[PDB]
Amino acid sequence: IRASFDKAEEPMLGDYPDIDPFPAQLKNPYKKYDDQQDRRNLEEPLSVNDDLYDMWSPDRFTHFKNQDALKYFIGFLTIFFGASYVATYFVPEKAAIPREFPYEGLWKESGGTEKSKAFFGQRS
Amino acid sequence: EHQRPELVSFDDINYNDHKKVREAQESYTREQFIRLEALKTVRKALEKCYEESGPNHFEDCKNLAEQYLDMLPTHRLQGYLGYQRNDPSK
Amino acid sequence: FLTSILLSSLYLFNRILAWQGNVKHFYLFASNLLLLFIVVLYINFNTFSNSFQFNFELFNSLNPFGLSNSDISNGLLFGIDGLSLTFILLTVLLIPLTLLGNWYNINFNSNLYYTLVLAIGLVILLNFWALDYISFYILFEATLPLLFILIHIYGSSDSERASFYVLMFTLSGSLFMLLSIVVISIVLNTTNFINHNLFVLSLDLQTIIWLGLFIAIMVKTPLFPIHVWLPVVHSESPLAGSMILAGLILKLALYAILRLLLPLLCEAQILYTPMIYIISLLTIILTSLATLRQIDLKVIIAYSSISHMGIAILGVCSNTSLGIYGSIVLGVAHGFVSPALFLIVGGILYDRYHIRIVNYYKGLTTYMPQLATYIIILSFANIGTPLTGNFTGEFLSLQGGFIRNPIIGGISCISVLLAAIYQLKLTNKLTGGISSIYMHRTNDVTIREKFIMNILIISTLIIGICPQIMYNLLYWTVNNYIYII
Amino acid sequence: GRYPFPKDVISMTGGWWANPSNWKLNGLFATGIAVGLALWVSTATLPYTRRREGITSESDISKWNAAAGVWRERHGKISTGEA
Amino acid sequence: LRAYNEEKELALKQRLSQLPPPGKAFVTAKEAELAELAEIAALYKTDRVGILDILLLGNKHARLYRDNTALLKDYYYNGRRILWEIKREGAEKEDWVNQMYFLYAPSLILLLIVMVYKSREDITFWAKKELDQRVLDKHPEINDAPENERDALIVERIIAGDYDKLASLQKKAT
Amino acid sequence: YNAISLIIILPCISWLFPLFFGRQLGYVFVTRMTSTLIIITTLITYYYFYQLLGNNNPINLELFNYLNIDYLDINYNFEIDALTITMLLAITTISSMVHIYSIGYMETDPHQVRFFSLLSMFTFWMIILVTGSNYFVLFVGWEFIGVTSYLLISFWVTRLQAMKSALSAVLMNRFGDAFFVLGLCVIAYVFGTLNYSTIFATAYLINTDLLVLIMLALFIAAMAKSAQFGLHNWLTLAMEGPTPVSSLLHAATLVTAGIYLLLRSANILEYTPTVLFIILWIGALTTLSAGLIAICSNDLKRIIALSTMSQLGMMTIAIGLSAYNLALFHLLGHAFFKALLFMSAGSIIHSILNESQDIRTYGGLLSYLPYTYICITIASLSLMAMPGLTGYYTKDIIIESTYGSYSISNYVVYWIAYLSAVLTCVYSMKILYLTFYSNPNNNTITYYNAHESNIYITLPMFILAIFAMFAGWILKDIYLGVGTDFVGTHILPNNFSYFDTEFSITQFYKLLPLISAILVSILIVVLNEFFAIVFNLNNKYINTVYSIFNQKLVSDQILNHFIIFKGLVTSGNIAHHVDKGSLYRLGPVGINRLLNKASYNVINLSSNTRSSLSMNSMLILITIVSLLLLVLVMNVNFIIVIPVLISILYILFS
Numbered sequence A: 001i002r003a004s005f006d007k008a009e010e011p012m013l014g015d016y017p018d019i020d021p022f023p024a025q026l027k028n029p030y031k032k033y034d035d036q037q038d039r040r041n042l043e044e045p046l047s048v049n050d051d052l053y054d055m056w057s058p059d060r061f062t063h064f065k066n067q068d069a070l071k072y073f074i075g076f077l078t079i080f081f082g083a084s085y086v087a088t089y090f091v092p093e094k095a096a097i098p099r100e101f102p103y104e105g106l107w108k109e110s111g112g113t114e115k116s117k118a119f120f121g122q123r124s
Numbered sequence B: 001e002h003q004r005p006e007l008v009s010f011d012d013i014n015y016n017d018h019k020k021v022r023e024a025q026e027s028y029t030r031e032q033f034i035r036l037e038a039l040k041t042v043r044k045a046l047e048k049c050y051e052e053s054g055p056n057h058f059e060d061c062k063n064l065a066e067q068y069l070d071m072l073p074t075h076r077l078q079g080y081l082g083y084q085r086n087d088p089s090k
Numbered sequence C: 001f002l003t004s005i006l007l008s009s010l011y012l013f014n015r016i017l018a019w020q021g022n023v024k025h026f027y028l029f030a031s032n033l034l035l036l037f038i039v040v041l042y043i044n045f046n047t048f049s050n051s052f053q054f055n056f057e058l059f060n061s062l063n064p065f066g067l068s069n070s071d072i073s074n075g076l077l078f079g080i081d082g083l084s085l086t087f088i089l090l091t092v093l094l095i096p097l098t099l100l101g102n103w104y105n106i107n108f109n110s111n112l113y114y115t116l117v118l119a120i121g122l123v124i125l126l127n128f129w130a131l132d133y134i135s136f137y138i139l140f141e142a143t144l145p146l147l148f149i150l151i152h153i154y155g156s157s158d159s160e161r162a163s164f165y166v167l168m169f170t171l172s173g174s175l176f177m178l179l180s181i182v183v184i185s186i187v188l189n190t191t192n193f194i195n196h197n198l199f200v201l202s203l204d205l206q207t208i209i210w211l212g213l214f215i216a217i218m219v220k221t222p223l224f225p226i227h228v229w230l231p232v233v234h235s236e237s238p239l240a241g242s243m244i245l246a247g248l249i250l251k252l253a254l255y256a257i258l259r260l261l262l263p264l265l266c267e268a269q270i271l272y273t274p275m276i277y278i279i280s281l282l283t284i285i286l287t288s289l290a291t292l293r294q295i296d297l298k299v300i301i302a303y304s305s306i307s308h309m310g311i312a313i314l315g316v317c318s319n320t321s322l323g324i325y326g327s328i329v330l331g332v333a334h335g336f337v338s339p340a341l342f343l344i345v346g347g348i349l350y351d352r353y354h355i356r357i358v359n360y361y362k363g364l365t366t367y368m369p370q371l372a373t374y375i376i377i378l379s380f381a382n383i384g385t386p387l388t389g390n391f392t393g394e395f396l397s398l399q400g401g402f403i404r405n406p407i408i409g410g411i412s413c414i415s416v417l418l419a420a421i422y423q424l425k426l427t428n429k430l431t432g433g434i435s436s437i438y439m440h441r442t443n444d445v446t447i448r449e450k451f452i453m454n455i456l457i458i459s460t461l462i463i464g465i466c467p468q469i470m471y472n473l474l475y476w477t478v479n480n481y482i483y484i485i
Numbered sequence D: 001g002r003y004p005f006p007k008d009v010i011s012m013t014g015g016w017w018a019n020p021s022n023w024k025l026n027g028l029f030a031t032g033i034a035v036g037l038a039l040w041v042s043t044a045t046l047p048y049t050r051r052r053e054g055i056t057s058e059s060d061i062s063k064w065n066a067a068a069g070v071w072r073e074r075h076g077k078i079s080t081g082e083a
Numbered sequence E: 001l002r003a004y005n006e007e008k009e010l011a012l013k014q015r016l017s018q019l020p021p022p023g024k025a026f027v028t029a030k031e032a033e034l035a036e037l038a039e040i041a042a043l044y045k046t047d048r049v050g051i052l053d054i055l056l057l058g059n060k061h062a063r064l065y066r067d068n069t070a071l072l073k074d075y076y077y078n079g080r081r082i083l084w085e086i087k088r089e090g091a092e093k094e095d096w097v098n099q100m101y102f103l104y105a106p107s108l109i110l111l112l113i114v115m116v117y118k119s120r121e122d123i124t125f126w127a128k129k130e131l132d133q134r135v136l137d138k139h140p141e142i143n144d145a146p147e148n149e150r151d152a153l154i155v156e157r158i159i160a161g162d163y164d165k166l167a168s169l170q171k172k173a174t
Numbered sequence F: 001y002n003a004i005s006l007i008i009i010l011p012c013i014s015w016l017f018p019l020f021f022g023r024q025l026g027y028v029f030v031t032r033m034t035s036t037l038i039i040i041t042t043l044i045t046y047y048y049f050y051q052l053l054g055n056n057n058p059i060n061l062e063l064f065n066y067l068n069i070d071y072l073d074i075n076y077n078f079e080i081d082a083l084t085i086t087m088l089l090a091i092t093t094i095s096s097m098v099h100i101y102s103i104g105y106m107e108t109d110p111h112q113v114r115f116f117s118l119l120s121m122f123t124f125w126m127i128i129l130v131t132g133s134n135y136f137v138l139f140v141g142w143e144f145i146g147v148t149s150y151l152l153i154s155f156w157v158t159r160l161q162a163m164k165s166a167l168s169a170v171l172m173n174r175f176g177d178a179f180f181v182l183g184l185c186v187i188a189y190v191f192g193t194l195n196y197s198t199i200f201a202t203a204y205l206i207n208t209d210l211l212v213l214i215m216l217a218l219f220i221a222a223m224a225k226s227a228q229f230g231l232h233n234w235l236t237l238a239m240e241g242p243t244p245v246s247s248l249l250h251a252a253t254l255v256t257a258g259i260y261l262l263l264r265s266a267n268i269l270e271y272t273p274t275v276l277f278i279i280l281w282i283g284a285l286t287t288l289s290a291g292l293i294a295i296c297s298n299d300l301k302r303i304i305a306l307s308t309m310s311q312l313g314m315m316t317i318a319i320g321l322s323a324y325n326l327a328l329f330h331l332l333g334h335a336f337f338k339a340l341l342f343m344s345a346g347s348i349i350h351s352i353l354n355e356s357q358d359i360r361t362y363g364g365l366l367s368y369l370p371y372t373y374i375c376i377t378i379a380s381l382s383l384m385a386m387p388g389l390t391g392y393y394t395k396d397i398i399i400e401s402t403y404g405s406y407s408i409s410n411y412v413v414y415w416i417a418y419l420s421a422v423l424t425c426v427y428s429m430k431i432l433y434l435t436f437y438s439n440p441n442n443n444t445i446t447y448y449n450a451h452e453s454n455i456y457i458t459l460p461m462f463i464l465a466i467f468a469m470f471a472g473w474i475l476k477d478i479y480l481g482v483g484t485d486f487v488g489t490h491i492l493p494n495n496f497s498y499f500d501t502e503f504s505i506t507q508f509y510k511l512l513p514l515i516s517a518i519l520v521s522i523l524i525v526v527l528n529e530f531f532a533i534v535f536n537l538n539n540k541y542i543n544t545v546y547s548i549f550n551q552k553l554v555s556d557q558i559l560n561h562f563i564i565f566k567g568l569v570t571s572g573n574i575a576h577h578v579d580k581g582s583l584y585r586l587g588p589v590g591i592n593r594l595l596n597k598a599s600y601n602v603i604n605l606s607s608n609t610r611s612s613l614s615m616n617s618m619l620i621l622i623t624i625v626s627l628l629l630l631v632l633v634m635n636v637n638f639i640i641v642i643p644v645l646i647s648i649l650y651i652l653f654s
């Protein structure tokens, strides 16, 4: 009833009681059930798509609405990457040159031959 | 005993005899395996080069590494079917 | 001599039926004799020859009852290579295990059941010996009435619909197989597993012929358009029917795509491997995804078998030596590890509680610790967790499928994830939690069940630690089917 | 916590608080099997050990580089770098 | 090679004639009537028949014996389920363990051993020996080098040359 | 006597024998035996490290063939590299100390035979994962440590959250395993082998797009196991397993495996600049993200797990800067730190009668637990990199390696890592203040019954405190010399920036993280006692922000509702609407209805008339008329008679 896919399987059921789906975790823990673990009385009617509302289902957080939390998450991500990318413009530059190498940049040492010096070469 | 059966081709033979066709089949197959152990010999030689060389393996066995990576697309099992179903130069 | 052996043996059988009501002791004895005979044949097998070693002809005109020494041959040929003998060894070590698997649960009419199970095992044994297309096809559908009678008489509530589906879908794909076999036999005027790579057909005659054989293989290694009889014929079969089916029939169609299609449809096969890759990726992903919402317990292992056969088909259709070898290793290792899972769900779990719904079973460790040990070891062995033979097959088939097309190899590599999701989702539900309030405590696993399990686990572990032990049969047949010009 | 348990059930890793009376006596057997297996695996894998460096001469790898240059001369195979 | 007594078996059958059905012979939740049934269990357990009588005897002896062992097996196992019956130990052989541990399991270990030693015979060991034989064919001077120099001289010859004859086979291609 | 072989065989004995003989030997024997054997193993690996400091001449052992197929051979080959012995001594030391610790920590738990067997199989497959010498044995150990992580996080099978937590951990790792199978397939395709020697001998020749594909797949594997920001949810959800399992799985072992994948692949990483850039920015993301969770979360075990993955990001920053000696040295010291921190946390959880984990419920325990205090103070002063201790030498030199890089925008990650330096002081002081210095929050009887634990709990804390003090100063010349030939990694000559990064640093930039890390620590403790209103404001904006940072930077909600629950809903869509819905309408459920209707129509074809004879004799007339009319149409044109016959079938069958 409550979810959109639970609404989607409405016309396929016939001779089936059409329960309101309620998550088995968001039930009270202190009401005594027949199984304390699954939080279920012994002959209680099961919803369609009951394994999405079982105890063994996802954890189903309570504190934020899900659209709120997607806004907050994509918020923090674009906060970090935006500050990351604007902070590349305000950098200072170096106090040394990048160091260079003998034997014409070790090209024979880095595999190489004389036709292949730009492919396997260093600063010289 | 290390017996060496004779080498037969797909081209001299009549295909209506089965003896010669089966031998040309097995010949082409075993020749691909000989090719393959040549490739494996160069691979073990190259890793011996790398382990003995240490830091200068770039220049001691540039040519062994180039040889292994040039042999690798061409030295494998290819199958007798592709040559026996089709004739080039025809 | 050979007739006197048989009417001695028929008299042996008649006397032990007269003095013992059951058959099962003699069926076990004949099964283990068949084992020893096939291993003596493997001793005398020449691995250095590509040709077919132990040939015999049945129903020749010059000798209709018996062997044939003739200038002219129009009967049914039989003989083996290493590729045939791999599946023969896998078949022959499973036949005593399925006769043993129902040693106590079938009570009412036992002798009929064990005769049907041994008869199905013998038909599938002779399937791998065959050397004509018509000799392959005759034994290829001799199984179906025996399967119909077995599924219909023995089973759960719904064994009528399952028996109908195992006749219907199999017959419906295999009739189009017969269409292509008839076209081959009227063009070539020979049906033969020996000569048939020498004949070259036209390209558009090949592409007509290839369709009917591939439709039957799509029905029997069940790829996505018809993958659908399989959960119901598993979920409602008896135990040996399920075990023989998912250990041998699916691998039989995996054998048929090598034996029947790759030699004389080469130039067709190259044109069609993207369509096979569509269908096999699409039966890996969508079936592996549809297992996540299943209420029943044998149906999960049926859908698992779909996903593993979908991995094996892109190994055989990879045009690579690695893919062919990995598909053979996958078929043999799957034929080991999956009947053990069907024994876990159908033997140790349905004999004790007679329900198969997932919602009753929780916390099986605290009363059955070694059953739970078996469940987790088999779950990980089924996933693609290495040193198991399943990972060797899955890894080499994914590698061959990456060579033939790297993008469908990239999206086919996620089967490692998808195969583990549903399997571990089932396994932690079965093992974890407080013990179920619905289940009353029963016996732990017995000696015969542990015996079957230990054999089917050691034989995956030996292939998983060293897959080289059966390369000596396959190194010809891994080069035989490659078409790389 | 020492809640009661059923002694019905037999697991290979022990059960709940598994502590047999002859655990000294069995411990001597486990001691012997462990040291014998470790000693035997220790000596069995001895010739399968080798060092990483110093196995083959440098003569070997110099002439293998030379023969790789030979196999590269005969096929006219060009460098990575020249295009 | 063994034989049985028939009027032992007919006295057995009329012993079982006045006994209750096995569906109530133990449902009494004692040895006034439960001490004659454990005798009958112990008589089920021992082998009356051997193989020489199986072949040379006729059939109503066999039918007599068959319903005898059916009712005796019933009296053994139902007493074992409800409750010789009144003992508890572990030495026991069920019906399948004779030809699964002594025929199936050694045949399977035989299959393992035949696969392991049949793996010596393969194309990779043979192909390395053939490639060595071919370079010893072409260059026999490697023959009189000493033993571990021979190894690397073979390897440098393998790197220096094709030694296939694959283009030899494709004469129609060339 | 074979040193390379005993390292392998002794934890396998230590695993196989507690299972096969657990009922026969019992817990009091198997505990001492399992620990005894791992003690002998780690003494052997210390001695082997001491010998390899003599000559850099490693040992491999060879075993039988895994598979020989055409161009591809795989062998079981095992060598101890310098990199291998570096990881090996750390994992065996932490292994043996966690074994000795759990002797006394698990004293009243029933099932410790299975527990110690699972600990030593975890150790064993870690040994195999590190000492393997192709990518295949790396994969084998890589999977079996995930199987053991299932079997260890789910040790209490009765607990529901433990079962679901082990399920989430193994499915995250399996995501990474799928990407490693992809990269492994490309490895065996491109190089034709899996052996490290052949792949690193030919790595500089291979095309760079190929190597970007390979290293991205292997980095998604390493990123899943070493718990970066896309995939961090399972570390924090692995605290349902017990304390020494968490000190195995999070201090060294299971998170080090993902760093070991990149440290092996360093020689094939160098020829890529693309992947290393991505590695660096993912790690710079996770340092900040894990520090920001860890300041605002409240469970002690979760704070220490996020304290792990704040430093894993520092190590992958050191990967991204092309400096693998730094990441390896930090990897070495971090194991000793976090093992001491997890075990001191377990001793204060064990010492409280309540067995609570909320630090809001701890209160002051300085007077009552001085030994746990001094060990946790050593551990946190080392992890804050305060000088003279191991974390100085491991952790700071990465932060100035960010500045002394050659590339320009590495300067930005200088600040980012530095920010996470300050934050890793902050929560650390929280978990020293609210636990030892605060006014008490628990009831009085906990403070009556607070005592110190056994010798089995206190002795590994002593040994790892000594190690976490002295290990950096002894092993610094091994891993940070200015010219060192110990680790046989080959840095490209331009990606090597070590000589530049120790000399080009400002007085201010080197002075800065030391003095600031000590100033923020002293300020956070003095403000939480003297004032305590700065952190207990109740602006609802700061409470919203606090509960964002408390619920793991809302990531597990974003993963749960939008990937897990979404995927379960689409899988139900397939299992109902496609497989049972529309593939049966083209299958056995639709064909039954079609044949029912067609049969009903052709049977009612002659239902009408009372007469048999008039019915059938008119029926004969209709056909010998109709067929004649059809062929009259049909020799004119064949196209105009196909729909006539379709319509005749329609009116006949419907």
Ligand SMILES: CCCCCCCCCCCCCCCCCC(=O)OC[C@H](COP(=O)(O)OCCN)OC(=O)CCCCCCCCCCCCCCCCC
Residues within 6 Å of the ligand: C054, C055, C056, C058, C067, C119, C122, C123, C125, C126, C129, C138, C139, C142
């Ligand atoms: C019921 C479905 C209907 C299907 C109908 C199709 C045909 C059915 C025929 C049923 C029986 C088929 C099996 C017949 C076995 C014959 C055995 C045989 O042919 O061996 C002889 C062959 C030649 O040997 P040779 O050296 O020439 O000297 C002869 C003296 N031994 O020796 C060799 O060269 C080696 C060959 C070894 C034989 C191995 C055979 C493996 C399978 C044996 C069990 C099969 C039982 C099948 C029964 C169910 C039928 C499906």
Ligand SMILES: CCCCCCCCCCCCCCCCCC(=O)OC[C@H](COP(=O)(O)OCCN)OC(=O)CCCCCCCCCCCCCCCCC
Residues within 6 Å of the ligand: A056, A057, A058, A059, A060, C285, C292, C414, C421, C425, F161, F164, F165, F167, F168, F169, F171, F172, F175, F220, F230, F231, F237, F560, F563, F564, F567, F568
């Ligand atoms: C590009 C590389 C870089 C990417 C970086 C960013 C990555 C973001 C995406 C990450 C995806 C990670 C892998 C997803 C599978 C993880 C599965 C899992 O963790 O299951 C957990 C869930 C229990 O979780 P929970 O109950 O919330 O916590 C329990 C602890 N108290 O267990 C259960 O509830 C069991 C039932 C559900 C099991 C999952 C079923 C749905 C899984 C759908 C995944 C589909 C992936 C393939 C999609 C493509 C298919 C073509």
Ligand SMILES: CCCCCCCCCCCC(=O)OC[C@H](COP(=O)(O)OCC[N+](C)(C)C)OC(=O)CCCCCCCCCCC
Residues within 6 Å of the ligand: C461, C462, C465, C466, E116, F062, F063, F064, F065, F076
């Ligand atoms: C970490 C997971 C490993 C699991 C180990 C399981 C037990 C296997 C121990 C074999 C070690 C060994 O016997 O090896 C040693 C030998 C030799 O080695 P070689 O180099 O090939 O020959 C020498 C080459 N020379 C000459 C160049 C040096 O091996 C073999 O060739 C025999 C292969 C037999 C493998 C059969 C395995 C069957 C399954 C057994 C388990 C159910």
